[PDB]
């Protein structure tokens, strides 16, 4: 079920403000969010 959760969570998270680092020109890293090899690429959401 993990995937069907991740998507939904992201859908809920991106409506809440933006990430200021996205204008810095510095790409974000692919942080692992579990075992088995799942990864996420997103800057911290700062400006609400």
**Sites of contact with another protein (CB under 8 A):** 22-23, 25, 27, 30, 41
Query: Least separation, in Å, of the C-beta of 25 and another protein?
Result: 5
Query: Least separation, in Å, of the C-beta of 48 and another protein?
Result: 20
- Cβ pair 39, 31 in contact under 8 A: yes
Specify the length of the chain in residues.
48
| Closer of 35 and 41 to another protein (Cβ) | 41
What's the rounded Cα separation, in Å, for the pair 37 and 4?
16
Query: Least separation, in Å, of the C-beta of 9 and another protein?
Result: 14
Token pair 């200021």 is found at: 20
């Amino acid at each position: 079920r993990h995937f069907d959760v991740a998507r939904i969570l992201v859908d809920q998270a991106v409506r809440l403000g933006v990430a200021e680092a996205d204008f810095s020109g510095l790409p974000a890293e692919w942080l692992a969010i579990n075992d088995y090899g799942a990864k996420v690429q997103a800057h911290v959401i700062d400006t609400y």
